[PDB]
Amino acid sequence: GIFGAIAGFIENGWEGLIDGWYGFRHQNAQGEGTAADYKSTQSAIDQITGKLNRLIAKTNQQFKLIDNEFNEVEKQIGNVINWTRDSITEVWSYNAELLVAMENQHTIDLADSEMDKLYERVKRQLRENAEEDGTGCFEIFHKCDDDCMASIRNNTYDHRKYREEAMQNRI
Amino acid sequence: GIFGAIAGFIENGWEGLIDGWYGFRHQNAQGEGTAADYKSTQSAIDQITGKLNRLIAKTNQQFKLIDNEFNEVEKQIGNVINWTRDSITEVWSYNAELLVAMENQHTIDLADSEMDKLYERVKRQLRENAEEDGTGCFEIFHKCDDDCMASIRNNTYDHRKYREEAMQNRI
Amino acid sequence: GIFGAIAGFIENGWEGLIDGWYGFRHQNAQGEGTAADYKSTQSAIDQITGKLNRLIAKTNQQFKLIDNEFNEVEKQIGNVINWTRDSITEVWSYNAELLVAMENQHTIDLADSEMDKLYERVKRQLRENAEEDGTGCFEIFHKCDDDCMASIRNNTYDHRKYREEAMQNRI
Amino acid sequence: DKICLGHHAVSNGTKVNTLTERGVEVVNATETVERTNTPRICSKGKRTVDLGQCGLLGTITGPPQCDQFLEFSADLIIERREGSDVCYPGKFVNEEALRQILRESGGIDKEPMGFTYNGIRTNGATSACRRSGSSFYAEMKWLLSNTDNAAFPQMTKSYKNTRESPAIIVWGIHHSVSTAEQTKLYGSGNKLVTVGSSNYQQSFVPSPGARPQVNGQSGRIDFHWLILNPNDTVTFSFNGAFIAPDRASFLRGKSMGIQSRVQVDANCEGDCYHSGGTIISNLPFQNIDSRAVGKCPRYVKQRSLLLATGMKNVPE
Amino acid sequence: DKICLGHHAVSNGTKVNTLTERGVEVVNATETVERTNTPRICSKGKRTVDLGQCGLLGTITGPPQCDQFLEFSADLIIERREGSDVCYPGKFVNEEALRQILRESGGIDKEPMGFTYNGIRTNGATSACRRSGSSFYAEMKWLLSNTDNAAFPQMTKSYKNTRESPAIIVWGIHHSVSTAEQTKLYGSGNKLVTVGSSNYQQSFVPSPGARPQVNGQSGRIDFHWLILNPNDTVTFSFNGAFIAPDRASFLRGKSMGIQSRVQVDANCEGDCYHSGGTIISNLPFQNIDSRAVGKCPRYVKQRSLLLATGMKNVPE
Amino acid sequence: DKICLGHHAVSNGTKVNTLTERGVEVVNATETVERTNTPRICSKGKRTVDLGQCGLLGTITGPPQCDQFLEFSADLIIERREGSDVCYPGKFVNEEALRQILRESGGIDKEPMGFTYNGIRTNGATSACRRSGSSFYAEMKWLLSNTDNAAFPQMTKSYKNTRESPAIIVWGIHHSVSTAEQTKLYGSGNKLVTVGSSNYQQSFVPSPGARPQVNGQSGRIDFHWLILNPNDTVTFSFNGAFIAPDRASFLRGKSMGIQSRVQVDANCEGDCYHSGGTIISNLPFQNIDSRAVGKCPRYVKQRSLLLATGMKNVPE
């Protein structure tokens, strides 16, 4: 939702991956494998962490009794106190449910944002020595081994090296 | 605004289209025509529908009289009641005007998001057999008939069939 | 953050640029230079200006004394007044700190949004006569002189002009 | 050959407000603040009592207006401007607290306290309180001395609340136009009425004096009351100038009380009431009446706040 | 040859807070909470009355402090700590309700009730209330028995409210230092003052006794009041210990009342007042005084809350 | 050969609510509303006084329940349902204001007013107030006439407050079962107790009469009080039926007062209290008790509101 990635063009996610939130699954010569991108995972977690420190927070404003549970106060002032407290309860119940919905919209769409940032950071590494498969992988039209893979995953990969190979592999 | 599509690179929209929110206009062999994309339209409407069910909602909290329209209450407690009621009125007028502005920002930018998701779902189907015109069309550099069109609109279109055909038309 | 541009694939910004917020730096035959995009700058500023007119605003609702700084009121009603005022203070302190955080999230991410709209706005002009550098410029694989530069900056640039040239300069 | 994408639009957008700009055109919008009153007490499905000319507090003392309301039972109690708590002129001490109790009581159920009396008369009427000629508060007793100027034997009477719910006890204090006629009614001397439950102690003395005529009467009765809790006694020590409780009142349940100037209507359902009618609406906010009671949309100052239900309207 | 895009930055960012981070550098920011007081009653363009040493409630009774304020007229009323409601020591019953009425009255306009008196003195002065030597409350009348110990003929007096606005009626009750001099002033016997309108009934008895000296005086006057509505009467039945109203007060309009310790200044316009000055600001919130009145930014606890007016500042 | 991007998921999502949808699966969530009470007064680190059977207002008058609480000192005061302010039956006038003062006083410190008495007795006891047999309020003195029916010499006594803090002065008024025994205790006649201290004037008369027995007693003492400010005098003018203050009480500091039915526990720290225990929680909101006092999460109506801490959970 909203950035098109999660529950979008990358249909369903990976119960497999356990070292992080976002990750690479490759299929090359040596076979299939997976590995988690720590850098996008950390940017998500610590943004979520920011939200929790803002809300799991302490009022230091003290309130006292204006009321009495044992010997009821005079009923006119009693009804004004209850009327006021009920009105304030309405405000905070509204604030709370709106706060949680608002930050939930932002949390979900913030995670969706962090992978489209991941998708299009490598689409930019691999220049046009690949194309988009459409469902969130990259068709590498040249050969890339387990050392060329970690080349992408850690942002070293040069595309000029395999530009030659790839340009006519694609025709 | 914000995702670049509506009132952006697709400047102005189609008073023509009336079966949905988002749609395809093609111009091929047989000519011009239009047809509405039911899934993106539904994803928009149903999100807006979520918002309306959240706000067109009923408090079950009952409030009673603490006041009197016929025989005015004593003036000190009268002034505390009015002072309190006025303060809460300020809160709800603030909450209301902020709620509506906040959800209007999100609604507008949510509709713009659902089209950039539409654009780039098609740019990924048409792979390298088209290019971006710039103003939100795709220049199909090969021939596409009314069955080639509903191929795209229904997410069937294979690009390898016309890959041969597009690659020599583009030089 | 969130649209990937500012503090993303465009590492750091330009203390140089002072006629606006967003701008072009070119390196061509004659050399380096910079110039600011007034139109994206204006849409940013004018959105920020909207926020300020909404918040730098005056209530026209008058409140009066229910209290007394010289001859304290009787203590029961005194404690209800203070209890009420303190509760309302808690609401406005909460509203204020949430308002400023919420609009700060939106301001920062709307500025990042206005550049990704800028980026993918020229990538659409330069069609296939350039490619992504990765770090926020376009490698122009053909010649562009100081009149071809202002060709892009004011949205006239035709790509068919240098399409011939560029296609084989890229091989 | 080419394919274009686009979005719909219209010739007549609705303008709305956002975080960043005032009056952006959107396709369709809907209103968020209710302005439409319906000028009737929408009472469908609810046991309703319209007190008309009876005042709420009359239900406890019993002036002629309130003869049909001495033991009412309701989900919704309606107070009218023409209502009056009183036949002989006077006041309730701590009066709006009693009203707030009665409004939410779901009605009252009376029970005699069966006070008997030795050595006085029990039966003073007056021209202000007309039934068949001169009458008096139905639920109360004008306690007079035997004959003009005779002694008021200083008495005591007690009533215990047998019952499992708390009781509303009410007595009166008569303020005679003069000290002269304070004497004709209850003999001479300082007149001390004292009253205590266990959980309550207080005491009263009349104040004869001249005040202007109301219902042709220059005297006054002010009424007092206390909530007698289950299994506690109230004792009435007194020597004259005392209007005495015939019956104690008990509360039936829960109700909603309102004040209104419009008609009952059993054809419509509502839960948000004000004095000019009923607010029927799903909307979260309303701009009709800040003192609306019941289960209501929140009152806001703004007359309108449009919520977008569609995209930007961009025409050509 | 290439083209690069970028965005501006600076060496000196302002830190702000967001939903996800504390202290992120942005290019430019502006503060949202007002901290700057301006220490004067910025009163430009408004009919202002600074009561100085007159107390607000003195305007109704008329102690020497308040001689030039008995018929004031204002948009803005200013109360001072040095002000005093009183010359002979005493107090107002239910006093802060009266102050709240007077603060928003836009001033008062007096009208005589023209009470005439047979068979007593009308003119008791005192050394506490000094004009030319011993005087008394200007708007009131110390009603004495003819000669020392003489009878106080038990009287009645009425005033009807001719006007179309409601009236503020005020009377006094004198508490003599002893029972002896309660007798020297108003004769012997139980002293009963009762007061009623038609929709108001109450009554009063003095309480002689020793209390410590204030303005050289060990006695006390407490004042009472009621709002008499158009076309109704108030009747004063009494037999001594009674300070009587010469004039009734009427309300002029609307005003704003404040309490302050700083100077008036006609050079600045403001609408948000507190006791240490005026809050002049467009900002939505303020952290200066939680009891500020008028048309004010909302009080919040935080001293500062910066709102971003620019993008992230990213330098090298 | 190809490379895929993805995101994690799980077999077991937590459902949450958003601006646009109800019950969306997210990877992980955390609760925002506290539901867990802990059923003890978590009092670790705080000077705590549990009044048990002593009532808060007994601390100033001194009934036997309160003998070890006449000079307490605390950060946290705890009131119990079994507590009682009283030995001889009666009540405090303007009683809940006094409680609110005492709850936040951080304790009280007594000082004698050293009133001496000529020409009366000083020492009336009662079986309701049992110490060694028949006793009385520790901080007060039942002032009687010398011998049965003898005169009560009309007296005055003053106390000035030497100290830099304000003082709580309290006296009593005795309401005898009859006018007969009002005479046996304090002689015949109208008996007027009057009281004034500079910025306070008021006055009192007993009201003898029959009331039902409580602690075997059909009489009543009602207590009164005033705050005497530094360097001010209070004068007690009276002629009998006056329970007199032996000692004045002063406030020590700041405290927090609560009402509770659970046990003190010095093993846990908390700052949010209600009558069924303590709310220990970092969470912003709570759904346990709307009248919780101290430093508390905000009470909300909802029992649960889950806050997303992970992405959407999309499985296969």
Ligand SMILES: *[C@@H]1O[C@H](CO)[C@@H](O)[C@H](O)[C@H]1NC(C)=O
């Ligand atoms: C006010 O509410 C409390 C519960 O919060 C209730 O026990 C009390 O009875 C209410 N007030 C009156 C006057 O009944």
Ligand SMILES: *[C@@H]1O[C@H](CO)[C@@H](O)[C@H](O)[C@H]1NC(C)=O
């Ligand atoms: C309080 O507000 C009500 C309704 O807004 C108004 O009728 C009333 O006059 C106000 N209070 C007083 C004391 O007049």
Ligand SMILES: *[C@@H]1O[C@H](CO)[C@@H](O)[C@H](O)[C@H]1NC(C)=O
């Ligand atoms: C209410 O708060 C004010 C300060 O805001 C304080 O001076 C006053 O004493 C408080 N009320 C009571 C009854 O203490």
Ligand SMILES: *[C@@H]1O[C@H](CO)[C@@H](O)[C@H](O)[C@H]1NC(C)=O
């Ligand atoms: C009241 O008194 C009777 C004694 O006969 C007793 O049975 C009953 O339980 C008491 N309590 C209540 C609440 O009625």
Ligand SMILES: *[C@@H]1O[C@H](CO)[C@@H](O)[C@H](O)[C@H]1NC(C)=O
């Ligand atoms: C900074 O922001 C304030 C308020 O928006 C504005 O008045 C000022 O001109 C701004 N300065 C710059 C350099 O943008």
Ligand SMILES: *[C@@H]1O[C@H](CO)[C@@H](O)[C@H](O)[C@H]1NC(C)=O
């Ligand atoms: C008041 O009294 C006079 C009676 O002569 C009358 O003209 C006027 O209409 C009355 N009513 C009001 C509301 O003033």
Ligand SMILES: *[C@@H]1O[C@H](CO)[C@@H](O)[C@H](O)[C@H]1NC(C)=O
């Ligand atoms: C779930 O969320 C809470 C709060 O963010 C955290 O304490 C807990 O460790 C989380 N668990 C997992 C598996 O993420």
Ligand SMILES: *[C@@H]1O[C@H](CO)[C@@H](O)[C@H](O)[C@H]1NC(C)=O
């Ligand atoms: C009280 O009185 C004495 C006079 O002996 C003086 O020293 C002191 O400053 C006065 N003021 C206060 C506030 O105690």
